[PDB]
RNA sequence: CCCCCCC
RNA sequence: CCCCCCC
RNA sequence: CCCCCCC
RNA sequence: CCCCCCC
RNA sequence: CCCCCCC
């Protein structure tokens, strides 16, 4: 069953329309010096509105592809979005979809904190703490791949796992820019993804483009590294599923679970079909995504949270155990494996 | 029977849920060189109402210990409680749960005796007499350690055992700070234990974090001195039958005495089963205490009182002696084996 | 034949289907904080109608494991009880299958007993006295835990039992509460074991729940003790014969019981093989209970109420002894060994 | 319906 | 985010 | 039929 | 029910 | 609470 399904969803000849009287803005990569400026003058400052942080991040992304690229890019991801370009005004740049107030209060604010910073101190300051450092909007694209890799998680969670994890992978640029706000930022993406779900097709076209660069500097590498550890987002099942296997749980054994191992096998056999794009389905909000859960096996999906809760993989997983026996003896046996 | 009902209660997959519509205060470590003043200007001046003490103790700890995994060690304790965070105001506290009016009377009266020391006298502070002294937080959490260990105890032997006992173990404190009133944060200490539970499990918590540093000041190898002091809290019974075990009490091999010799081997058997956290169960208000007791053996509780009572350890313990006539004959072999 | 009779019972493929009609109260966790206000107000006050105490209790543990989790006790309990949900009015409660004349007549009867208290008296009413403390519940089910351990027993035997070990193991609550009727209480919750036998199972999950948890107050882990000491109930023919084992009864060595010896061994083999759960069958009037009924061994039965006679345990036992003969004969030898 | 931890 | 020794 | 004490 | 001393 | 001499 599970093959036809994604057979007939896969061998559709009609194509979706949505978003069809929409817009949105990109930024040609002749302002990509500026758009820098911009998206630094967010990470030095102490803003009190943080609104378009990730339609920033998103600009500096439209400079680095390019607005055609950027464009095709938006058409083949089902959306019929008219990409408006950017323009310049006295210079300061004019964002569709983007207020000018709040890029006028983002520039006075970082100018004055400048203005203070320089005034009260030595005036000794280096070449990376200042907004127009050419790693800034990859370090703001940072803070949106950390918040891009809990999109499947809740807000809080979201939120909660960003902050946490930037103060720690994001040490360096927080050192370098004593005040940004990581939390204010990071709602900022997650609302931006929430909002325009082509903006995920954007962010993933990005990552790949970076991956595939020849060189880059370490922002860059660190950006690719935490996309890269948003890839199985929203099938952790999966992966503790293999898990259970290479631990070789002897309830995995168990007559129900031998029961649904065929078409739990089947699941497999239908990521291996979609191959390397079926890990992004549930970060693009892939509407094919959900062919690929387990809920269908409550006993293996039970077996395989009791293995992960034994080996302390499951942490505080907030999944339901359908059946609490073989929950419970998994996870015995798990432990005892373990010890 | 013993081992039967330890297997029922460990063997449990359902997570009991408790204050679940309850919150809780901590301070993150950025303010810990605020608290410190705080917990030291409840030192030095003679304040009418000690209510918070503990409280800010135990801010002190989430300090220490940081705020998210203070919050991870009250999730872990079987409570529900919301950490709230602490703010500033003007600059001084505002811990959730804790009176502004108590912070502001306790500082203007720490700030008014500091004026009426340094005015009379020739102004010459030394650098421990201060309230910003660094161990003070640390000096506060040893009055409550000490009462601490006197929480199976009850209330009025607890505060009279902190202070008789602080007047040695504080001396050192108590001349620095020579008004420092030891009954008044005990009874506070003794209060914040029984009314919030999962600050057991938060001091603990401290206990640990402190006795694993690699370095610490002599405060802090006080206050770990006390805590391990406190180990075996609520299971006197038992170190009083290792005790008689090693004093070859005749009366053990009484005809009585051997018939209960294995469930009480039973018991031990179930303390080596539990292991290093069972020394803590009694702290805790663990409810699987209570499978340590010797209530079910009285004739080798009567024995085992009676020895203690001979060597004189048995001081002015309240527990019962059930037979009392092989409690007397264990006490009379004891004092002559004494002689 | 014994470990047939078991096999046979325990290997069934069909379940049982009972109470198919018939549906029970619960309450959700979100009006824990309105069940405790009951749960006290019927610890306070001296009411004429004390019927649905035992409901009042179960509601309180059935916010505690919560609604969901109850009604799953429910069904793997073999009753097809349905469960009606708790709802409020104008607040108050209205508990399905408790009248809410009743309600109404409790409330009103503590509010009044507490005017009465605070207008005559200096109004300096202490924390634990109010009705809203947050252990008055569980001081509830400690009287309800009491009357558990005599389930096995008669119903008067119950209730005086109850009513003596609760002006000792309730004496703190009885202080708190001058005018608490544990008689009337402990007959409530004997109804309520009678009538809703499934409720013995949901009691049963939640003195689990509780002494799986990792910290409790003091009524909790008293709760907790009293549910532990109610664990062999309705097989203190087992416990002493291991007594008489324990205590080398000469009369164990006579023909006949050496006879029944054999089978002897068989009984405490099958609880071995049950387990855990084996001491709870009489209490859940499990009616697989009576495999492990040593009344197919007469002679041995005498021998161990002899025992238990002589070394004074059989205190006032009202169990059949068989062969007089071997009961007076083992009596004497366990008087004269206990001399 | 699906998703839900950590890095 | 990643990296981190020696030759 | 089973259960039946004390804590 | 449990706990109960001293350090 | 712990520590406390000599070399």
Redesign the interface.
Known sequence: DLSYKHAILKESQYTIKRDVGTTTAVTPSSLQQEITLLCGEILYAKHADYKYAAEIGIQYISTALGSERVQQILRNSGSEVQVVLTRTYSQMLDIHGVEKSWVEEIDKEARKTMATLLKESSGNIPQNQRPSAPDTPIILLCVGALIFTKLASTIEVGLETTV?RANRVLSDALKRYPRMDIPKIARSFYDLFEQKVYHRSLFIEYGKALGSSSTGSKAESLFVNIFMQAYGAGQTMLRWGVIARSSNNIMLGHVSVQAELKQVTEVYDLVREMGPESGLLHLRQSPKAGLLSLANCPNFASVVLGNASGLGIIGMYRGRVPN?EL??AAE?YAKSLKE
Chains 1, 2, 3 share one sequence.
């Open positions: 946490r609490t929950f419970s015995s």
